[PDB]
Ligand binder design. Structure first.
Ligand SMILES: [Mg+2]
Ligand SMILES: [Mg+2]
Ligand SMILES: [Mg+2]
Ligand SMILES: [Mg+2]
Ligand SMILES: [Mg+2]
Ligand SMILES: [Mg+2]
Ligand SMILES: [Mg+2]
Ligand SMILES: [Mg+2]
Ligand SMILES: [Mg+2]
Ligand SMILES: [Mg+2]
Ligand SMILES: [Mg+2]
Ligand SMILES: [Mg+2]
Ligand SMILES: [Mg+2]
Ligand SMILES: [Mg+2]
Ligand SMILES: [Mg+2]
Ligand SMILES: [Mg+2]
Ligand SMILES: [Mg+2]
Ligand SMILES: [Mg+2]
Ligand SMILES: [Mg+2]
Ligand SMILES: [Mg+2]
Ligand SMILES: [Zn+2]
Ligand SMILES: [Zn+2]
Lengths: 59, 169, 109, 50, 292, 54, 188, 117
RNA sequence: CACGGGAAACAGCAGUGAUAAAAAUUAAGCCAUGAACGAAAGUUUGACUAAGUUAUAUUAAUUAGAGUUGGUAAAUCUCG
RNA sequence: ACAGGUUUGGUCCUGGCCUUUCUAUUAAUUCUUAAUAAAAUUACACAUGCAAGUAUCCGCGCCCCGGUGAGAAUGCCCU
């Protein structure tokens, strides 16, 4: 890979990222599916933390 | 080995066969014995045979020996708690010192088998890696799976240049 | 309960080599190390510095060294715990009577 | 509703343990609350709860 | 009633029936040979070494537990039919934790139908062999258990090796285990070859397929052919335990019981061919008349 | 034994140097976040703002 | 001779030539020193040519490599250790070494050729079929009513205010394509 | 080696014989190399279907939930596997890619029936 | 050890002089994985994937050429 | 090492040197194809291209992967 102190390309300069298109149905649907997803997952995570506490402090 | 007058004790086998293992409290061990007498006899025998086995099995434990200081032979033990154990060895047979030391600070054969079991479960059959740590490696090997392309060149389709020559054209 | 010394040294038996510094004993420690070629154990020695409060150690003594929780100097990791054998004066731990070599100076009766 | 394989797991272990109560495996979403991404994050320090 | 192999009656009787032959028990193995070690012994120490050889031969004579046939398990933990559209081949997920008993493991399958189903017994077996490799076990099923190979092997009188094949390769409650076990007992029933497995640990399998299938024929005839009275009487005792209420059982029991009485009565009330059992119980009796 | 004795004096020098020069040359936010509106180009950071932010 | 192996090994030509001794009994390999190159020659038989002093196997073309003959494939495997012989032991070329290995393997696999199979105890120690993994669990309240396992496996068409603000944000870049998910897959 | 930062990450390390890939579920550091050093082996994955047509995955769930229990992050395909397994909820982009495929199947059934005409 | 000084850095991927007994493509994509950001679609990645070049090593056939023939050590005749 | 040749008119003894085994480079002679792997003289100088971006600002990242073995008896192991 590159490094901090390396010079940037001549072809990378005049180019800033052009975003991908958005679709409303799919998008909102996704914000929800994901919202709920990391919801149940951040739940199972705290569950696993309770597990770790249990194993260790019962050790 | 020829030289030495009981070379069988410089064997690797004789070092792993002799059994006493020391607790985690025992750190220093002093052996104080006498040169001249028929009353120090088995002790010198204990030095000349068993100290080898002890020491091998107990590397981090310092063992020392003092000759002809005190008129009668003994063992001294210095533990982590500052507990100083004293084992009087006089007319004792070699084996009696062995098994009495085994008695005082041993480790239950149970404890040993449990510990070694803890270390054997550390080696897992299911994993995959270099031949050093595990058995199987890339699963070129395992039965139902795909034979890896070194041994058995795969069908023409599954090749990358086939998929690219088909995608381009 | 935290008081520790990171040194493997936690307890040692060692001879007293020298008195040459103030309140500090120079102690010879002797371990059995295995030579892998011959399969044979020899005495490898290490010179340890110890702190004595009494300045009590004559040269040639047998001394029990206790680890010090916090190092004093670079070279002082230890404390004289107890004197196991005094040089020229030894009391039998077994019978508690004074001795020189194999000779009881004070016998029973 | 605990995810299918993990549900079968909890059911199997509470079954082998000797507990026959068939009650559903209910998970609590109580502490899982997440702010949406427009929520400004405080830049101060790391809070140490003593 | 509750008769089973692991009951102390069936166990002590199969133990006294099996017999210990230290020659067949401890046999030359085709393993890489090492040089023999020697020692000089007293009489006492020779008897001690004998009792020791017998004591290890006991644990070598340990019988593989017999088990009835498991019932194939199909259960669906979940369904999502949006995942059916993936159109990919089966995913198989296996739980490996060293502590968990292999009966307690979770073997999972996700199909192109996008449903979560539990794997079958043969699939569980071959997965637990892939990820917990065990020696004697072939992940892909052996060609040797085909009937051609099996029969060509039986001609070689190798029955103990096929029985041993099945002990390692498959599982005690599986289908093919009981299949080729009972098939083996069949092909030792047709050739009268029972005495092969005499000193073998597979004897219990013989007596416990044959007391249930209710042909005690060749076993009793080969027991009174070798002039062993106590083994035929103990076999009749077994058919008396696993079948308590029947004509032969309670009649030839309540009437009277001994070697001659119970053996001759369970010879005439066991009707497959009683002529050979009565002719052989006539033969060991005339030869018990001649030698004494 | 294992003993490696060796000084490094300029390992600290560069630290004091970089730190003091850092606090003295620390950019005030006036020129820093200052932006050229036509090119959408930051003179200070050389960082061109994203296409959704114009 | 055709494929049938037992024919020549029972034969009088064989019993005359090799006698009762094994094949390779009289064979000797010729090399640069007292120590033979650590694995023998690749293939002795090439194109139409057989090279020099041929192997015990391939000098006589009446001998066939198959998994059928116990007779031919016996002497190339040790009696007492029951292990195959590497090519330097016997003297056979390596092609035939590999062919013999696969042969003897396919011989032991069909039960034609003996080997040692040890006593191995049963897999499990205790068998309990009673576990919740083996026996069918109590299928969930989400299974009996056929419900998707979570609220979000079912596609919900969003409110129009939310979608029109979602257009209001993305206005220049927006690609708006209706998202109803046709329920059954198949196609040509 | 010694890094500036980074997290414990459960991911897929790629070993391979080139055109027959094989994966190892592995507990590691984020900034260390792909197949490189790791804390503990967790599981494995087999990309190519076998004689019975089965892509094979071995997972250790006790240690998976111990490491996820100690604050580990999971990679995208690790959530594909753990989601499909049922130990986790199905990832949203599985159902999203589902939707994409379903709609492209209807659009191309309509393409097949527009071409047949 | 870089505050400073010489001075203007491929010991990243390609490629090029000089030098050495030592000679891969100034090649294609982020499709798989890992990484960086991201709420998220996703964007980038000479890591990597798939190629391309080489008898440098194994596998396999389509492919026959090299060394040797006093002794150790397999194998020789007539001339010069 | 299962050892072999080689001191003397000759025999032992001591004793090096060499051969027979396996691997890697380069070279000379030859070489049909594909597959798998590995690709390396040179801490000598470097033409041209590219290897760090992402993202509603800020921010996060930018020898992390990757290269090399120059240097240092450096260091493995173990607190
Ligand atoms: Mg500077
Ligand atoms: Mg380069
Ligand atoms: Mg650079
Ligand atoms: Mg050049
Ligand atoms: Mg590029
Ligand atoms: Mg390649
Ligand atoms: Mg070559
Ligand atoms: Mg080759
Ligand atoms: Mg040619
Ligand atoms: Mg010759
Ligand atoms: Mg001379
Ligand atoms: Mg001469
Ligand atoms: Mg002379
Ligand atoms: Mg020479
Ligand atoms: Mg070359
Ligand atoms: Mg090269
Ligand atoms: Mg340079
Ligand atoms: Mg490195
Ligand atoms: Mg390196
Ligand atoms: Mg030095
Ligand atoms: Zn492979
Ligand atoms: Zn040949």
């Amino acid at each position: 890979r590159k490094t901090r102190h390396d010079p940037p390309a001549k072809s990378k300069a005049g180019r800033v990222a052009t975003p991908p298109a958005v679709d409303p149905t799919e998008f909102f649907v996704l914000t929800e599916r994901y919202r709920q997803y990391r919801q149940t997952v951040r739940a199972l995570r705290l569950e696993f933390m309770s597990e770790v506490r249990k194993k260790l402090h019962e050790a | 080995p020829m030289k030495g007058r009981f070379p069988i004790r410089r064997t690797l086998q004789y070092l792993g066969q002799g059994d006493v293992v020391f607790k985690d409290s025992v750190k220093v061990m002093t052996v104080n014995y006498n040169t001249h007498g028929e009353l120090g006899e088995g002790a010198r025998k204990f030095v000349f045979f068993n100290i080898p086995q002890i020491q091998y099995k107990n590397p981090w434990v310092q063992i020392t020996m003092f000759k002809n200081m005190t008129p009668s032979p003994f063992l001294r033990f210095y533990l982590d708690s500052g507990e100083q154990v004293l084992v009087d060895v006089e007319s004792k047979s070699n084996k009696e010192i062995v098994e009495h030391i085994r008695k005082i600070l041993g480790k239950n054969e149970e404890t040993l088998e449990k510990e070694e079991q803890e270390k054997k479960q550390l080696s897992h059959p299911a994993h995959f890696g270099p031949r050093k740590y595990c058995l199987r490696e890339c699963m070129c090997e395992v039965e139902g799976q795909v034979p890896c392309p070194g041994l058995v060149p795969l069908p023409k389709e599954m090749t990358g240049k086939y998929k690219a020559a088909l995608k381009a054209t | 309960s935290i008081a520790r010394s990171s040194v493997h040294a936690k307890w040692v038996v060692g001879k007293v080599i020298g008195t040459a510094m103030q309140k500090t004993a120079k102690v010879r420690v002797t371990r059995l190390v295995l030579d892998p070629y011959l399969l044979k154990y020899f005495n490898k020695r290490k010179t340890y510095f110890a702190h004595d409060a009494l300045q009590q150690c004559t040269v040639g003594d047998i001394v029990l060294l206790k680890a010090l929780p916090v190092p004093r100097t670079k070279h002082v990791k230890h404390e004289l715990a107890e004197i196991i054998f005094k040089v020229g004066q030894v009391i039998d731990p077994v019978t508690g009577k004074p001795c020189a070599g194999t000779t009881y100076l004070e016998s029973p009766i | 509703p605990y995810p299918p394989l993990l549900r079968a797991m909890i059911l199997a272990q509470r079954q082998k343990y000797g507990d026959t109560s068939t009650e559903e495996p209910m998970l609590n979403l109580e502490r899982a609350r997440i702010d949406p991404w427009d929520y400004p994050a405080k830049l101060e320090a790391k809070t140490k709860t003593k | 009633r509750k008769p089973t192999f692991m009951d102390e009656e069936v166990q002590n009787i199969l133990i006294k029936m099996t017999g210990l032959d230290l020659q067949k028990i401890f046999k030359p193995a085709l393993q890489e040979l090492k040089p023999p070690t020697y020692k000089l012994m007293t009489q006492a120490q020779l008897e001690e070494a004998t009792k020791q050889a017998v004591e290890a031969a006991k644990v070598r004579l340990k019988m593989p537990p017999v088990l009835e046939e498991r019932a194939p398990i199909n259960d669906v933990l979940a369904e999502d039919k949006i995942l059916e559209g993936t159109e990919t081949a089966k995913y198989v997920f296996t739980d490996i934790s060293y502590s968990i008993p292999h009966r307690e493991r979770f073997i999972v399958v996700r199909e192109p139908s996008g449903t979560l189903r539990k794997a079958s017994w043969e699939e569980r077996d071959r997965m637990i062999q892939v990820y917990f490799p065990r020696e004697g076990r072939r992940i892909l099923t052996p060609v040797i258990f085909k009937e051609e190979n099996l029969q060509t092997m039986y001609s070689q009188d190798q029955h103990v090796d096929v029985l041993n094949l099945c002990v390692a390769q498959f599982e005690p409650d599986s289908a093919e285990y009981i299949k080729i076990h009972h098939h083996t007992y069949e092909d030792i029933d047709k050739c009268g070859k029972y005495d092969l497995l005499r000193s073998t640990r597979h004897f219990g399998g013989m007596a416990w397929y044959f007391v249930n299938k209710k042909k005690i024929d060749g076993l009793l005839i080969d027991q009174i052919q070798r002039d062993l009275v106590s083994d035929a009487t103990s076999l009749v005792h077994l058919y008396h335990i696993l079948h308590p209420x029947x004509x032969x059982x309670x009649x030839x029991x309540x009437x009277x019981x001994x070697x001659x009485x119970x053996x001759x009565x369970x010879x005439x009330x066991x009707x497959x061919x009683x002529x050979x059992x009565x002719x052989x119980x006539x033969x060991x009796x005339x030869x018990x008349x001649x030698x004494x | 034994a294992r003993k490696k004795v060796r000084p490094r004096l300029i390992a600290e020098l560069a630290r004091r140097v970089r730190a003091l020069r850092e606090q003295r040359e620390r950019p005030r936010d006036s020129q820093r976040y200052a932006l050229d509106y036509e090119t959408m180009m930051r003179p200070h950071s050389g960082n061109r703002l994203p296409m959704r932010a114009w | 001779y055709k494929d049938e192996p037992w024919k020549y090994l029972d034969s009088e030509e064989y019993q005359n030539r090799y006698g009762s001794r094994p094949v390779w009994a009289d064979y000797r390999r010729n090399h640069k020193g007292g120590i033979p190159p650590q694995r023998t020659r690749k293939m002795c038989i090439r194109g139409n040519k057989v090279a020099g002093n041929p192997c015990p196997i391939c000098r006589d073309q009446k001998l066939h490599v198959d998994f059928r003959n116990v007779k031919l494939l016996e002497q190339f495997v040790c009696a007492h250790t029951g292990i195959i012989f590497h090519a330097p032991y016997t003297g056979v070329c390596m092609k035939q070494h590999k062919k013999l290995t696969q042969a003897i393997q396919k011989a032991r696999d069909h039960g034609l050729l003996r080997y040692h199979i040890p006593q191995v105890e049963p897999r499990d120690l205790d068998f309990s079929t009673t576990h919740g993994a083996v026996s069918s669990t109590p299928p969930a309240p989400t299974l009996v009513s056929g419900d998707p396992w979570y609220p979000w496996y079912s596609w919900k068409q969003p409110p129009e205010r939310e979608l029109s603000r979602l257009r209001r944000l993305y206005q220049g870049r927006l690609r708006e394509e209706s998202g109803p998910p046709p329920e059954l897959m198949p196609e040509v | 080696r010694a890094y500036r930062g980074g997290h414990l990450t459960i991911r897929l390390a790629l070993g391979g014989c080139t055109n027959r890939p094989f994966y190892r579920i592995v507990a590691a550091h984020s900034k260390c190399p792909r197949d490189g050093r790791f804390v503990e082996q967790l599981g494995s994955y087999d990309p190519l279907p076998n004689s019975h047509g089965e892509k094979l995955v071995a997972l250790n769930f006790d240690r998976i939930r111990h490491w996820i229990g100690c604050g580990a992050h999971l990679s995208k395909p690790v959530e594909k596997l753990l989601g499909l397994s049922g130990f986790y909820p199905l990832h949203p982009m599985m159902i999203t890619n589902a939707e994409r495929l379903r709609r492209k199947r209807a659009r191309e059934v309509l393409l097949a029936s527009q071409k047949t005409d």
